[PDB]
Amino acid sequence: DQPRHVQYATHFPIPQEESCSHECNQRLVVLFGVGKQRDDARHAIKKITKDILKVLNRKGTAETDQLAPIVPLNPTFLGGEDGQKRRRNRPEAFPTAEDIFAKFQHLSHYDQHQVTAQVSRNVLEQITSFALGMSYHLPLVQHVQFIFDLMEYSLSISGLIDFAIQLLNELSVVEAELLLKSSDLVGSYTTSLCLCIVAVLRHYHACLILNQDQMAQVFEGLCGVVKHGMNRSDGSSAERCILAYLYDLYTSCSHLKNKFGELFSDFCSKVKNTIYCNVEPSESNMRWAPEFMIDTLENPAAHTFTYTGLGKSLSENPANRYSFVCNALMHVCVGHHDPDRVNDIAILCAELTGYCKSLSAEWLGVLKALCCSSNNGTCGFNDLLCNVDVSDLSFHDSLATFVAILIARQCLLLEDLIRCAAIPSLLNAACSEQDSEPGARLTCRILLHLFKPTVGIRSSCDRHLLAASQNRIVDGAVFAVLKAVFVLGDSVETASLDVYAKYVLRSICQQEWVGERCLKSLCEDSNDLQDPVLSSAQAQRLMQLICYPHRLLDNEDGENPQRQRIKRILQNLDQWTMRQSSLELQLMIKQTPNNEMNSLLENIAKATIEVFQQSAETSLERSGVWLVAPLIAKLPTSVQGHVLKAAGEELEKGQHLGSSSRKERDRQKQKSMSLLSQQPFLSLVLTCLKGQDEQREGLLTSLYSQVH
């Protein structure tokens, strides 16, 4: 049939545009050959996407389009896919088309040019029409969500920088022509679309670093236009991550401004200075101040309210804790499990507390109350089990989705959970066994839901939100919360109760993002995993889980399972994971107790001397043992020096076996060379000859042995 190379003909993309107008456009077609299809392929590839925009550009109704599946006689499989697009009729929870899925499968960068040029003509015709004298209508938001969910299949890179370029350019045109009108519609749909571009560039962090020769200096131009004129509703959009994440560019030129405020000079200095030095918080306490029945008075639909006016309202009382927690939980037990309701209640309540950044440090009481008995009271929790169904887990996906929405705000800090949550959970099971027994398993499942057998879910836009916000928290103490899970232990439903304590060990490490953070963390330093809080036996029983998930499951076997565990640490590593393969040794070498340092030397010496004899008696696959020397070289030579100076004479005694026939002496020589024909022997003593005492005695014995 077909060979392998014909499938990759479509897998050769050209990312850079405008290569050669006369040459590259005209010469590329004739490589495959002639075809009527390819000429009509260009005729209808834009036609299928122009129709859906012309009813959006001109706001054409859907009732005027009925003859689109009726006219074309050819609906072939791509053409017939055009006709079925009118079978869905009304909008629904409809997946993408198979062709658009197939463009994610193959040819994702050839077609990325037309779709990015398709949206380029849409965003530029409006800017010639918004200023044409009639269009003062703000851009809609309902089409924004569906257009990022479909553009991401092409793996676009050029679609990010151009839109960021054009939006800052057009707003300077707006202020020169639309500032004097002074309307009240400013910032309702532009600021919402402002953070959409910022967040999608955060998911494309490689593209934002290559344009730094005008990135920083444009922000004074685009933000400074509103201040010099009569500024209405100040600036609705303010950048937050710029003044903290950028460090390198300020060494060129640094300048100061003096147009902030009489008491806001220190305030707006700290608006830019958000790196450290937290100011003194709200001294008035925020515990049990609101009682009940206050959410009906306020309307979050009116977006015209401001953060500055919110300060005077909360200056009277910081009372935004209790009456909204009860309002939220009473509402969610009224509404159904439909996806529209559960996502909206998290995001609408978010902007109430989004500018209430002091409210971000008081949410611990929803878990601190049930964890400890310092709150006292027994009847306060019985109703909280009356409204919880523990048997059903399909509706626990919604609260698993809520905490994904809760972590997606990127301004809620969970650094209190390291100190005051995982540590007493050790003593929670230690002090009480039959009383707080659900506390171990309830904290087991909810942390799994934070870091999600598996089934392929269609969700992709919010699926990538969990890993994007993961690295925003430092990795200094997060694994201490992880280890506190592991040290506490010391058909899915068919499993019994006791076996779940062991599958959680695998399932936590099953996530590829869990494993890769531990692998990268040791690249800088290992002092954080040598803390005496960490366990002895349980630490290295999961290093083989840390290193690779797709390896075969090693089994507990025999009276001496560590005997074969020492003997396979050479074979299991390959010639490509050379970084962490030697890193696992010095952790378990130092974990070995001091009473058996003597037995811990000759094992690694003799491990490398029967790795050569099985090829002596009877290339790139065998290049791994031909290149174990880089692993040995990146080791403390105090251990290496004693075990390799011992390796010399035991391989210089391998040829010294006589007391038999003359002819067997020659065979035991040449079998010894075939296991001693390794250039790494010359390099292992090369490490050893630095920082040694004397090793000239061993080769004296060989010289004398053969001189006769």
Answer for the pair 489, 505: CB distance below 8 angstroms, yes or no. Answer: yes
Give, in degrees to the nearest 5, the angle at Cα 390 between 387 and 392. 105
- Annotate 661-683 with b (16+ C-beta within 10 A) or e (fewer): eeeeeeeeeeebeebbebebbeb
Nearest by Cα to 353 from 412, 434, 418? 412
**Residue 177 DSSP label:** T
Dihedral sign, Cα of residue 387, residue 393, residue 394, residue 398: positive
Residue 652 to residue 46: CA distance in whole angstroms: 77
72's tokens? 């074309």
Max Cα-Cα span within the chain: 110
Nearest by Cα to 114 from 59, 158, 70? 158
In sequence order, the 6+-apart residues with CB closer than 8 A to the CB of 170 are 127
71's tokens? 């006219």
Residue 638 to residue 230: CA distance in whole angstroms: 74
Resolution (A): 3.8
Nearest by Cα to 416 from 363, 346, 353? 363
Answer for the pair 477, 463: CB distance below 8 angstroms, yes or no. Answer: no
688's tokens? 């050893």
Residue 615 to residue 322: CA distance in whole angstroms: 74
Nearest by Cα to 492 from 500, 483, 484? 500
Neighbours of 508 (CB within 10 A): 19
Give, in degrees to the nearest 5, the angle at Cα 679 between 676 and 681. 60
Neighbours of 545 (CB within 10 A): 19
